[PDB]
Coordinates of C-alpha atoms (C1' of nucleotides) and ligand atoms in Angstrom, one line a residue:
Chain A
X1 CA -4.4 7.2 42.8
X2 CA -2.1 5.7 39.9
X3 CA 1.1 7.0 40.6
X4 CA 0.1 5.6 44.0
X5 CA -0.1 2.2 42.6
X6 CA 2.5 2.2 40.6
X7 CA 4.5 3.2 43.8
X8 CA 3.3 0.1 45.1
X9 CA 3.6 -2.6 42.1
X10 CA 7.6 -0.9 41.8
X11 CA 8.4 -2.8 45.2
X12 CA 8.0 -5.7 43.3
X13 CA 9.7 -5.6 40.0
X14 CA 12.6 -7.5 39.1
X15 CA 16.3 -5.4 39.3
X16 CA 20.0 -6.7 39.5
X17 CA 19.5 -8.2 43.1
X18 CA 16.1 -10.5 43.0
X19 CA 17.3 -11.6 39.4
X20 CA 18.8 -14.8 40.8
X21 CA 16.0 -15.4 43.0
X22 CA 13.2 -14.1 41.3
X23 CA 14.5 -16.4 37.8
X24 CA 14.9 -18.9 40.7
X25 CA 11.4 -19.1 42.2
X26 CA 9.4 -18.1 38.3
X27 CA 11.3 -21.7 37.2
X28 CA 9.6 -23.7 40.3
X29 CA 5.8 -22.4 39.8
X30 CA 3.7 -22.9 37.1
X31 CA 0.9 -21.2 36.2
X32 CA -2.0 -21.8 33.9
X33 CA -3.6 -18.7 31.9
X34 CA -6.3 -21.9 30.7
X35 CA -9.9 -21.6 31.7
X36 CA -13.2 -22.4 29.3
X37 CA -16.7 -21.2 28.9
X38 CA -20.2 -23.0 29.6
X39 CA -22.4 -22.7 27.7
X40 CA -24.8 -20.5 30.7
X41 CA -21.8 -17.9 30.6
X42 CA -19.9 -20.1 33.3
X43 CA -16.2 -19.8 33.8
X44 CA -14.3 -23.2 34.0
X45 CA -11.2 -23.7 36.0
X46 CA -8.8 -26.7 35.2
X47 CA -7.0 -26.9 38.6
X48 CA -9.2 -29.1 40.2
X49 CA -7.9 -32.3 38.2
Chain B
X1 CA 2.7 -3.5 32.5
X2 CA 3.8 -2.3 28.8
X3 CA 5.3 -4.8 26.4
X4 CA 4.4 -8.7 27.5
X5 CA 7.9 -11.4 26.2
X6 CA 6.2 -14.8 24.9
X7 CA 9.7 -16.5 25.1
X8 CA 9.8 -20.2 24.3
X9 CA 12.6 -22.2 25.1
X10 CA 14.8 -24.8 24.1
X11 CA 14.1 -27.5 26.8
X12 CA 16.4 -28.0 28.2
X13 CA 17.8 -29.1 32.6
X14 CA 17.4 -26.7 35.7
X15 CA 20.7 -25.3 35.5
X16 CA 20.6 -23.6 31.2
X17 CA 17.2 -22.7 31.3
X18 CA 18.0 -20.5 34.3
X19 CA 20.9 -19.7 32.9
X20 CA 19.4 -18.9 29.1
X21 CA 16.7 -16.5 31.7
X22 CA 19.4 -14.8 33.5
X23 CA 20.9 -13.7 30.5
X24 CA 17.8 -13.2 29.0
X25 CA 16.5 -10.4 31.2
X26 CA 19.7 -9.1 31.3
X27 CA 19.4 -8.2 27.9
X28 CA 16.3 -6.7 28.8
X29 CA 18.0 -4.2 31.8
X30 CA 20.5 -3.7 29.5
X31 CA 18.1 -2.2 26.6
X32 CA 16.8 0.0 28.8
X33 CA 13.5 -2.0 30.5
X34 CA 11.8 -2.4 33.8
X35 CA 10.9 -6.3 34.2
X36 CA 8.2 -6.4 36.4
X37 CA 7.6 -10.1 36.2
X38 CA 8.7 -13.8 35.0
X39 CA 6.0 -16.1 34.4
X40 CA 6.5 -20.2 33.8
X41 CA 3.8 -21.6 31.3
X42 CA 5.7 -24.8 31.9
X43 CA 7.4 -27.2 29.0
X44 CA 5.5 -28.7 26.9
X45 CA 5.0 -30.3 23.3
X46 CA 5.2 -27.4 20.8
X47 CA 2.4 -27.3 19.0
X48 CA 3.6 -27.8 15.9
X49 CA 7.3 -28.6 15.2
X50 CA 9.7 -25.2 14.9
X51 CA 12.9 -25.1 13.3
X52 CA 15.1 -23.3 14.9
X53 CA 19.5 -23.1 14.5
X54 CA 19.5 -25.7 12.4
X55 CA 18.1 -27.7 14.6
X56 CA 14.1 -29.2 14.1
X57 CA 12.2 -28.9 17.2
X58 CA 9.1 -30.6 19.8
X59 CA 8.9 -29.6 22.6
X60 CA 9.6 -26.0 24.8
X61 CA 9.5 -24.0 28.1
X62 CA 7.1 -21.1 27.7
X63 CA 8.1 -17.9 29.6
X64 CA 6.1 -14.8 30.1
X65 CA 8.5 -11.1 31.0
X66 CA 5.8 -8.3 32.1
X67 CA 7.9 -4.7 31.0
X68 CA 8.2 -1.7 30.8
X69 CA 10.5 -0.1 27.6
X70 CA 11.4 2.9 25.6
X71 CA 9.3 2.8 22.2
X72 CA 12.3 2.8 20.2
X73 CA 14.1 -0.3 22.1
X74 CA 11.3 -3.2 20.6
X75 CA 13.5 -3.8 17.7
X76 CA 16.8 -3.9 19.3
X77 CA 15.6 -6.9 21.9
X78 CA 14.1 -8.0 19.1
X79 CA 17.7 -8.3 17.5
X80 CA 19.1 -9.8 20.1
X81 CA 16.8 -12.9 20.7
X82 CA 16.9 -13.5 17.1
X83 CA 20.4 -14.4 17.2
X84 CA 20.4 -16.2 20.8
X85 CA 20.6 -20.0 19.5
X86 CA 19.0 -21.4 23.2
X87 CA 15.2 -19.7 22.1
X88 CA 12.5 -21.7 19.7
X89 CA 10.8 -18.5 19.1
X90 CA 10.5 -15.1 20.8
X91 CA 8.2 -12.3 20.8
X92 CA 6.7 -9.0 21.4
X93 CA 3.2 -7.7 22.0
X94 CA 2.3 -5.0 23.5
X95 CA 0.5 -6.1 26.9
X96 CA -3.0 -7.1 27.1
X97 CA -3.6 -5.7 30.6
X98 CA -3.1 -2.0 29.3
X99 CA -6.5 -2.7 26.5
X100 CA -9.5 -2.5 29.0
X101 CA -12.6 -3.8 28.8
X102 CA -16.1 -1.5 27.1
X103 CA -18.4 -2.9 28.2
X104 CA -21.1 -5.3 25.9
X105 CA -23.7 -3.8 26.7
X106 CA -25.8 -6.4 25.1
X107 CA -27.0 -7.1 21.8
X108 CA -28.6 -4.8 20.0
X109 CA -30.5 -6.7 17.3
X110 CA -30.9 -5.4 14.2
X111 CA -34.5 -5.1 12.5
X112 CA -34.8 -6.0 8.9
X113 CA -33.8 -3.1 6.6
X114 CA -36.9 -0.9 5.1
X115 CA -37.7 0.8 1.9
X116 CA -35.2 -1.2 -0.5
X117 CA -37.3 -1.1 -3.3
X118 CA -40.2 1.5 -4.1
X119 CA -43.8 1.1 -3.8
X120 CA -43.9 -0.2 -8.1
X121 CA -47.0 -2.7 -8.3
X122 CA -45.9 -5.8 -10.1
Chain C
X1 CA -28.6 -2.5 -26.6
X2 CA -26.3 0.2 -25.2
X3 CA -23.1 -1.7 -26.5
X4 CA -23.9 -0.9 -30.2
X5 CA -22.5 2.7 -29.2
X6 CA -19.5 1.2 -27.5
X7 CA -18.9 -1.7 -30.3
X8 CA -18.7 1.4 -33.0
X9 CA -16.1 2.6 -31.4
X10 CA -14.4 -0.3 -30.3
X11 CA -14.6 -1.2 -33.9
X12 CA -13.1 2.3 -34.2
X13 CA -9.9 2.0 -32.1
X14 CA -9.1 -1.0 -33.5
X15 CA -8.9 0.0 -37.1
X16 CA -7.4 2.9 -36.1
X17 CA -4.9 1.3 -34.3
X18 CA -3.7 -0.9 -36.6
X19 CA -2.9 2.0 -38.8
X20 CA -1.0 3.7 -36.3
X21 CA 1.1 0.0 -36.8
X22 CA 1.3 0.3 -40.2
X23 CA 2.1 3.9 -40.8
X24 CA 4.4 4.0 -38.1
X25 CA 7.3 5.5 -40.0
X26 CA 5.9 7.9 -41.9
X27 CA 4.9 8.7 -38.2
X28 CA 7.7 9.1 -36.8
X29 CA 8.9 11.4 -39.6
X30 CA 5.7 13.7 -39.6
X31 CA 6.4 13.7 -36.1
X32 CA 10.3 14.7 -36.2
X33 CA 9.7 17.3 -39.1
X34 CA 6.9 18.8 -37.0
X35 CA 9.3 18.9 -33.8
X36 CA 11.7 20.6 -36.0
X37 CA 9.3 23.0 -37.4
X38 CA 8.2 23.4 -33.8
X39 CA 12.4 25.0 -32.8
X40 CA 12.6 26.8 -35.3
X41 CA 9.7 29.2 -35.1
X42 CA 10.3 29.2 -31.4
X43 CA 14.1 30.5 -32.5
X44 CA 12.4 33.5 -34.6
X45 CA 10.4 34.4 -32.1
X46 CA 12.8 35.2 -29.7
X47 CA 15.0 36.6 -32.7
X48 CA 12.2 38.4 -33.8
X49 CA 12.3 40.2 -29.6
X50 CA 16.1 40.1 -29.2
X51 CA 16.0 43.0 -32.9
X52 CA 12.7 44.5 -32.4
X53 CA 14.7 45.5 -28.8
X54 CA 17.0 47.6 -31.2
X55 CA 19.8 45.2 -30.6
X56 CA 22.3 43.2 -33.1
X57 CA 23.5 40.7 -31.9
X58 CA 21.4 38.1 -28.9
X59 CA 22.6 39.5 -25.6
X60 CA 25.8 37.9 -24.5
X61 CA 26.1 34.8 -23.8
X62 CA 22.7 33.4 -25.3
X63 CA 23.0 29.9 -26.8
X64 CA 19.1 29.5 -27.3
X65 CA 18.2 25.7 -25.8
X66 CA 17.2 23.2 -27.5
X67 CA 13.3 22.5 -26.3
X68 CA 11.2 20.6 -28.8
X69 CA 13.9 18.4 -29.8
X70 CA 14.9 17.2 -26.4
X71 CA 16.9 13.9 -27.2
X72 CA 13.7 11.0 -26.3
Chain D
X1 CA 15.4 21.7 16.7
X2 CA 14.3 21.6 20.2
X3 CA 14.3 18.5 22.9
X4 CA 12.1 17.8 25.5
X5 CA 14.2 16.1 27.8
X6 CA 13.8 12.2 28.1
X7 CA 13.1 13.0 32.2
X8 CA 10.8 15.2 31.8
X9 CA 7.5 13.2 33.5
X10 CA 4.7 13.3 31.2
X11 CA 2.0 15.8 30.7
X12 CA -0.7 14.5 33.2
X13 CA 2.1 13.5 36.3
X14 CA 3.3 16.9 36.1
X15 CA 0.9 18.4 38.5
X16 CA 0.6 15.6 41.0
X17 CA 1.6 16.8 44.4
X18 CA 4.5 15.3 45.8
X19 CA 5.5 13.5 42.5
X20 CA 9.4 14.2 43.6
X21 CA 9.8 12.0 46.6
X22 CA 9.2 9.1 44.8
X23 CA 12.3 6.4 44.1
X24 CA 13.8 6.5 40.8
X25 CA 12.7 3.9 39.1
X26 CA 8.5 5.1 39.5
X27 CA 10.1 8.2 38.6
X28 CA 11.6 6.7 35.2
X29 CA 8.1 5.0 35.0
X30 CA 6.5 8.5 34.1
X31 CA 9.3 9.6 32.6
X32 CA 9.4 10.6 28.2
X33 CA 11.7 8.4 28.7
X34 CA 9.1 5.1 28.6
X35 CA 7.0 7.1 26.8
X36 CA 5.0 6.5 23.5
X37 CA 5.9 9.7 20.6
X38 CA 2.6 11.5 21.3
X39 CA 2.4 12.2 24.9
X40 CA 5.9 13.7 23.4
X41 CA 3.9 15.6 20.7
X42 CA 1.3 16.9 24.3
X43 CA 4.8 17.6 25.6
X44 CA 5.9 20.2 23.1
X45 CA 2.3 21.0 22.7
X46 CA 1.8 22.6 25.8
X47 CA 5.4 24.1 26.2
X48 CA 4.9 25.4 22.8
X49 CA 1.4 27.5 23.2
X50 CA 2.9 28.6 26.5
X51 CA 5.8 30.5 24.7
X52 CA 4.2 31.9 21.9
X53 CA 0.3 32.4 23.0
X54 CA -1.9 34.7 25.6
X55 CA -4.3 33.2 27.3
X56 CA -2.7 29.6 26.6
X57 CA -7.1 28.8 28.3
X58 CA -8.8 29.3 25.0
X59 CA -8.3 26.8 22.6
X60 CA -10.9 28.1 20.0
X61 CA -8.8 31.1 19.9
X62 CA -6.9 31.6 15.4
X63 CA -3.7 31.6 17.4
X64 CA -3.9 28.9 19.5
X65 CA -5.7 26.6 16.4
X66 CA -2.5 28.2 14.3
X67 CA 0.5 26.8 17.0
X68 CA -1.3 23.3 17.9
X69 CA -1.8 22.9 13.9
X70 CA 1.9 23.7 13.2
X71 CA 3.3 21.2 16.5
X72 CA 1.6 18.5 14.4
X73 CA 2.6 20.2 10.6
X74 CA 6.9 19.3 12.3
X75 CA 5.6 16.3 13.4
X76 CA 4.5 15.0 9.9
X77 CA 7.9 16.7 8.7
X78 CA 9.6 14.1 11.4
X79 CA 8.3 11.2 9.6
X80 CA 8.2 12.8 6.3
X81 CA 12.0 12.4 6.5
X82 CA 12.1 8.7 7.4
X83 CA 9.8 7.3 5.4
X84 CA 10.1 8.7 2.2
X85 CA 7.7 6.9 0.3
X86 CA 4.4 7.0 2.2
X87 CA 2.0 9.1 -0.1
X88 CA 0.1 9.1 2.5
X89 CA 1.6 11.6 5.1
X90 CA 2.9 13.8 2.2
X91 CA -0.9 13.7 1.5
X92 CA -1.7 15.2 5.2
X93 CA 1.1 16.5 5.3
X94 CA 0.6 19.6 2.3
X95 CA -3.1 19.5 3.6
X96 CA -2.6 20.4 6.8
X97 CA 0.1 22.9 5.8
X98 CA -2.6 25.1 3.9
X99 CA -5.0 25.0 6.9
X100 CA -2.9 26.4 8.8
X101 CA -2.0 29.5 6.1
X102 CA -5.5 29.9 5.3
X103 CA -5.9 30.5 9.1
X104 CA -3.0 33.1 9.0
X105 CA -4.1 34.8 6.2
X106 CA -7.5 34.8 8.3
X107 CA -5.6 36.6 11.3
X108 CA -3.4 38.4 9.4
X109 CA -7.2 40.0 8.0
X110 CA -8.7 40.5 11.5
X111 CA -6.1 41.0 14.2
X112 CA -2.8 42.4 13.1
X113 CA -0.8 42.4 15.7
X114 CA -1.3 39.3 17.1
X115 CA -0.7 37.9 13.1
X116 CA 2.4 39.6 13.5
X117 CA 3.9 38.1 16.9
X118 CA 2.6 34.3 15.5
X119 CA 4.8 34.5 12.3
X120 CA 8.1 36.0 14.3
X121 CA 7.5 33.2 17.1
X122 CA 7.0 30.3 15.0
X123 CA 9.4 31.1 12.1
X124 CA 6.3 31.1 9.3
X125 CA 6.8 32.9 7.5
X126 CA 3.6 34.4 5.1
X127 CA 3.3 34.7 1.5
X128 CA 0.5 36.1 -0.9
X129 CA -0.8 33.9 -3.0
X130 CA 0.3 34.9 -6.4
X131 CA -2.2 35.9 -9.3
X132 CA -1.9 33.4 -12.5
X133 CA -1.5 30.1 -11.3
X134 CA 0.0 28.9 -14.3
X135 CA 2.1 25.6 -15.1
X136 CA 5.9 27.6 -16.3
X137 CA 6.7 25.0 -19.4
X138 CA 10.3 25.0 -20.9
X139 CA 9.5 27.1 -24.2
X140 CA 7.8 30.1 -21.5
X141 CA 10.5 29.9 -19.2
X142 CA 13.4 30.2 -22.0
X143 CA 11.3 33.2 -23.4
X144 CA 10.8 35.1 -20.1
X145 CA 14.6 34.1 -19.5
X146 CA 15.7 35.9 -22.5
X147 CA 13.4 39.1 -22.4
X148 CA 14.7 40.0 -19.6
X149 CA 18.3 39.6 -20.6
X150 CA 17.7 41.8 -24.2
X151 CA 16.2 44.5 -21.7
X152 CA 19.1 44.9 -18.7
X153 CA 21.2 44.6 -22.5
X154 CA 19.2 47.8 -23.7
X155 CA 18.9 49.5 -20.8
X156 CA 22.7 49.2 -19.9
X157 CA 23.2 50.4 -24.0
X158 CA 21.2 53.3 -23.0
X159 CA 23.4 54.3 -20.0
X160 CA 26.5 53.9 -21.8
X161 CA 25.1 56.0 -25.2
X162 CA 24.2 59.1 -22.0
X163 CA 27.8 58.5 -20.4
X164 CA 28.8 59.0 -23.9
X165 CA 26.6 62.2 -24.4
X166 CA 27.0 63.9 -21.2
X167 CA 31.6 63.3 -21.7
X168 CA 31.0 64.8 -26.1
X169 CA 29.0 68.0 -24.4
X170 CA 31.2 68.5 -21.3
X171 CA 34.3 68.6 -22.9
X172 CA 32.7 70.4 -26.0
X173 CA 31.2 73.5 -23.7
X174 CA 34.6 73.9 -21.5
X175 CA 36.9 74.5 -24.5
Chain E
rA1 C1' 4.9 3.8 5.2
rG2 C1' 8.9 1.3 7.5
rA3 C1' 11.5 -2.8 10.3
rG4 C1' 11.1 -7.7 11.5
rU5 C1' 8.5 -12.9 11.8
rU6 C1' 5.6 -18.0 9.0
rA7 C1' 0.9 -21.9 9.5
rA8 C1' -0.9 -24.0 5.0
rA9 C1' 0.8 -25.5 0.1
rU10 C1' 4.5 -25.6 -3.4
rU11 C1' 9.6 -27.2 -5.1
rA12 C1' 16.0 -27.6 -6.2
rU13 C1' 17.7 -32.1 -3.1
rA14 C1' 18.1 -37.3 -1.5
rA15 C1' 17.0 -42.1 0.4
rC16 C1' 13.2 -46.4 -1.0
rU17 C1' 9.6 -48.9 -4.0
rA18 C1' 6.9 -49.4 -8.4
rA19 C1' 6.7 -49.0 -14.4
rG20 C1' 5.0 -46.4 -15.9
rC21 C1' 3.4 -40.9 -15.1
rU22 C1' 0.9 -37.0 -17.5
rG23 C1' -3.1 -35.2 -19.9
rU24 C1' -8.5 -34.8 -21.9
rA25 C1' -16.2 -35.7 -24.5
rA26 C1' -12.6 -38.7 -26.5
rA27 C1' -6.7 -38.4 -28.0
rA28 C1' -2.4 -37.0 -29.5
rA29 C1' 2.1 -35.2 -28.3
rG30 C1' 5.2 -34.0 -23.9
rC31 C1' 7.8 -36.8 -19.5
rC32 C1' 10.0 -41.6 -18.2
rC33 C1' 16.6 -36.8 -15.0
rU34 C1' 9.0 -39.5 -14.4
rA35 C1' 5.5 -41.4 -10.1
rG36 C1' 4.1 -43.0 -4.4
rU37 C1' 5.9 -42.3 0.0
rU38 C1' 9.5 -40.0 3.5
rA39 C1' 12.8 -35.4 4.8
rA40 C1' 13.2 -30.2 3.4
rA41 C1' 15.6 -24.2 2.5
rA42 C1' 14.5 -20.0 -1.1
rU43 C1' 10.5 -18.2 -4.0
rA44 C1' 5.3 -16.5 -4.0
rA45 C1' 0.9 -15.7 -2.3
rA46 C1' -1.9 -15.0 1.9
rA47 C1' -8.2 -21.2 3.8
rU48 C1' -11.2 -20.9 7.8
rA49 C1' -12.9 -16.2 10.8
rA50 C1' -15.9 -13.2 6.3
rC51 C1' -23.6 -15.3 6.7
rC52 C1' -18.8 -9.5 9.5
rC53 C1' -18.8 -4.1 6.5
rA54 C1' -14.1 -2.0 9.2
rC55 C1' -10.3 2.0 7.7
rG56 C1' -8.8 5.1 3.4
rA57 C1' -9.3 11.4 -0.4
rA58 C1' -10.0 8.2 -4.2
rA59 C1' -8.0 4.5 -6.0
rG60 C1' -7.1 0.8 -2.1
rU61 C1' -6.7 -2.2 2.6
rG62 C1' -8.9 -8.7 5.5
rA63 C1' -1.5 -14.2 7.9
rC64 C1' 1.5 -12.7 12.6
rU65 C1' 4.5 -8.4 15.8
rC66 C1' 6.2 -3.5 17.2
rU67 C1' 7.6 1.8 15.6
rA68 C1' 5.0 6.1 13.0
rA69 C1' 0.6 7.1 11.7
rU70 C1' -4.8 8.5 9.6
rA71 C1' -5.3 17.9 7.6
rA72 C1' -9.6 21.8 9.0
rU73 C1' -14.1 24.6 15.8
rC74 C1' -15.1 21.2 9.5
rC75 C1' -19.2 25.7 2.8
rU76 C1' -18.0 26.0 -2.4
rG77 C1' -13.7 26.2 -4.5
rA78 C1' -9.5 25.2 -9.8
rC79 C1' -6.3 24.6 -15.5
rA80 C1' -2.4 25.7 -9.3
rC81 C1' -0.9 21.7 -6.2
rA82 C1' 0.1 15.5 -4.2
rC83 C1' -2.0 11.2 -5.3
rG84 C1' -4.4 7.8 -8.6
rA85 C1' -6.0 0.0 -10.8
rU86 C1' -3.6 -3.6 -14.2
rA87 C1' -1.4 -2.7 -17.9
rG88 C1' 3.4 -0.9 -20.0
rC89 C1' 9.2 1.4 -20.2
rU90 C1' 13.7 2.2 -17.9
rA91 C1' 18.0 0.1 -14.9
rG92 C1' 19.7 -3.7 -10.6
rG93 C1' 17.6 -8.2 -7.8
rA94 C1' 14.3 -12.1 -7.7
rC95 C1' 11.5 -16.8 -10.1
rC96 C1' 7.9 -21.5 -6.4
rC97 C1' 3.9 -21.4 -9.2
rA98 C1' 1.3 -18.8 -13.4
rA99 C1' 1.1 -17.3 -17.7
rA100 C1' 0.8 -13.0 -23.5
rC101 C1' 4.0 -14.5 -27.1
rU102 C1' 6.0 -18.5 -29.8
rG103 C1' 6.7 -24.3 -30.6
rG104 C1' 4.8 -28.9 -30.7
rG105 C1' -0.4 -32.1 -30.2
rA106 C1' -6.0 -32.5 -31.2
rU107 C1' -10.1 -30.5 -33.8
rU108 C1' -11.8 -28.3 -37.8
rA109 C1' -14.0 -27.3 -44.6
rG110 C1' -9.9 -24.3 -42.4
rA111 C1' -8.4 -22.8 -36.6
rU112 C1' -3.0 -18.4 -37.5
rA113 C1' -9.4 -19.9 -31.4
rC114 C1' -11.5 -22.2 -28.0
rC115 C1' -9.3 -28.4 -25.4
rC116 C1' -3.4 -30.6 -24.7
rC117 C1' 2.0 -29.4 -23.3
rA118 C1' 6.1 -26.7 -23.3
rC119 C1' 8.8 -22.2 -22.1
rU120 C1' 9.4 -16.8 -22.6
rA121 C1' 8.1 -11.4 -21.5
rU122 C1' 5.4 -10.0 -17.8
rG123 C1' 2.8 -10.9 -12.4
rC124 C1' 8.2 -10.0 -7.2
rC125 C1' 12.1 -6.3 -4.8
rU126 C1' 14.7 -2.1 -4.9
rA127 C1' 15.0 3.0 -6.8
rG128 C1' 12.6 6.3 -11.6
rC129 C1' 9.2 6.7 -15.2
rC130 C1' 4.3 6.0 -17.5
rC131 C1' -1.6 8.8 -15.7
rU132 C1' -5.0 5.8 -18.7
rA133 C1' -9.6 1.4 -17.1
rA134 C1' -17.6 -0.7 -18.1
rA135 C1' -10.8 4.9 -12.3
rC136 C1' -19.2 3.0 -12.9
rC137 C1' -22.2 2.6 -6.9
rC138 C1' -22.8 5.0 -14.8
rA139 C1' -26.6 8.4 -9.1
rA140 C1' -21.3 16.1 -8.1
rA141 C1' -20.1 18.6 -2.9
rU142 C1' -22.7 20.6 1.3
rA143 C1' -27.0 21.6 4.3
rG144 C1' -32.0 19.8 4.4
rU145 C1' -37.2 17.8 3.5
rU146 C1' -40.9 13.0 3.3
rA147 C1' -44.9 18.6 1.7
rC148 C1' -46.8 18.5 -3.5
rA149 C1' -46.3 13.7 -6.1
rU150 C1' -46.1 8.3 -10.3
rA151 C1' -43.8 8.8 -18.5
rA152 C1' -41.0 4.1 -18.7
rC153 C1' -37.3 1.0 -16.4
rA154 C1' -33.7 1.0 -12.6
rA155 C1' -31.8 2.4 -6.7
rA156 C1' -38.9 6.3 -4.5
rA157 C1' -39.3 12.2 -4.4
rC158 C1' -37.9 17.0 -3.5
rU159 C1' -35.7 22.4 -2.0
rA160 C1' -31.1 25.3 -0.9
Ligands
MG201 MG1 -16.3 3.4 -37.5
MG202 MG1 16.1 -21.7 -6.5
MG203 MG1 2.8 -41.2 -26.4
MG204 MG1 -3.6 -16.5 5.7
MG205 MG1 -10.3 14.2 9.8
MG206 MG1 -12.4 22.6 0.0
MG207 MG1 -0.3 4.0 -12.3
MG208 MG1 5.5 -3.7 -13.6
MG209 MG1 14.7 -6.4 -15.2
MG210 MG1 9.4 -16.2 -15.8
MG211 MG1 1.2 -23.6 -17.5
MG212 MG1 -0.3 -24.0 -33.3
MG213 MG1 9.3 -0.6 0.3
MG214 MG1 -13.2 0.6 -9.4
MG215 MG1 -18.4 9.3 -15.6
MG216 MG1 -17.6 19.0 -6.6

RNA sequence: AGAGUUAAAUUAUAACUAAGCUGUAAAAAGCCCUAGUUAAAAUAAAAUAACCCACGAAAGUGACUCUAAUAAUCCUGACACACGAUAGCUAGGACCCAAACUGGGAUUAGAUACCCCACUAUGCCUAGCCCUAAACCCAAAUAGUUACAUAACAAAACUA
């Protein structure tokens, strides 16, 4: 399973060709790692702003 | 994903940023690394003022680079990012997705401790 | 309680250290003397050995190093 | 020194089917190339336990333990060559060496054929402990050196005296 | 153990502004090349988390990152082997701040002290020594039991 999984993920890695495209791609798409918790044990996410 | 590169870049325009990211990743692939992904956490005001390369910096761009690399080479990449004048501050952490979460089964309550003293009648 | 014992030793030690300070170069002299003596008794022990083995001179190339008189 | 080649494809992924059909990149991520040091130790351990042993399946056997411990020891050696002043690992090394040796002295007393083989294969050399551990100090070292030189002189002189005796008595007996 | 890094302080050093600043139970001496604010390398030391109790054989270890890594299919065992807080020694480098010593100021009958100010060896790094601590949890290691059973106090009593 691990080898197959990595076999899949490898399609997506950054290479000498993808460099130009991928970089310009990532410069377009900001991501957040941010989220908060509630006293209940619940996750709260910011993107609803 | 094996290592995580936390890059804080000097805040600049589009092309120059793109250039810095490109040359950085290239250096990574030359130290033998395989780069999985490139993430952009945006540009913000830095939490405190960061002094690097005879500049006192206020804002910065934030990036993550997940990559696999031979253990030997972290020192090398580190050296390289050190002397790049476009990097506000570099760091390389073991990728947080390698460590996996064990299960808090819960909080085992601890009883008050007993027999700390003898049965003497004062 | 127990300190009375400690106190005693404490005093003893102090008084003795004091004394080593006063008596110092006297002590130096006596220890250097004992070291010479030691070296000598050692040489005699060796000489005694090669003689009781019937030899006249010490065996070829034997210098009998100075171990105790070794420079501080 | 041995060389578990960079491309060697770590222990756990060696026997999974059709591995060799996978593209260069994944093969590369499963290599000893991207590996830890601990993976190179796993490999080294397997390889040694295959060269040296008889039944690589028994972890329990004395011989097996000796091989394993020997891998660990060679590893501390490497580490100690890089860090001279780490006293903690010096401890592990000296200690773990004593354990090896204890086990060897236990093989030699039980299965000798195997012990013989192991010592040959791992290049370990088994020395008997001395009787009397005493610190050789300046006085004793010197005196003993003297006593040995004295002895060598004396018996050489008895040899010369017997040469003179033989020559004299022979040249007398002839005429 | 290595290598890399630095948030809060602190300081060289300028720029303004003020005549004082520092210091005590209270003063004096010191400093005014001082003080407050604004800027700042190096050095050293690691708030909070910790009401946690982990790692290491012990001494010890609680800023961050990576590399290497924590003997034994696990009984006891030296005078043998390898370590070992602080202080101290040798050599080279560092020096913010602390500080034995010493010099000033008080205090006092005296004050070679406690209190105030300066400053040094030293605390730091590299390399080598030194091998000592109330190195004490004053409770040896390894297996066990809670039976019999209170000198006192303390951390209950005991077997092999
Ligand atoms: Mg007395
Ligand atoms: Mg300076
Ligand atoms: Mg005055
Ligand atoms: Mg801290
Ligand atoms: Mg263990
Ligand atoms: Mg033992
Ligand atoms: Mg010491
Ligand atoms: Mg020292
Ligand atoms: Mg010095
Ligand atoms: Mg100084
Ligand atoms: Mg001071
Ligand atoms: Mg005085
Ligand atoms: Mg060092
Ligand atoms: Mg202690
Ligand atoms: Mg004791
Ligand atoms: Mg014991």
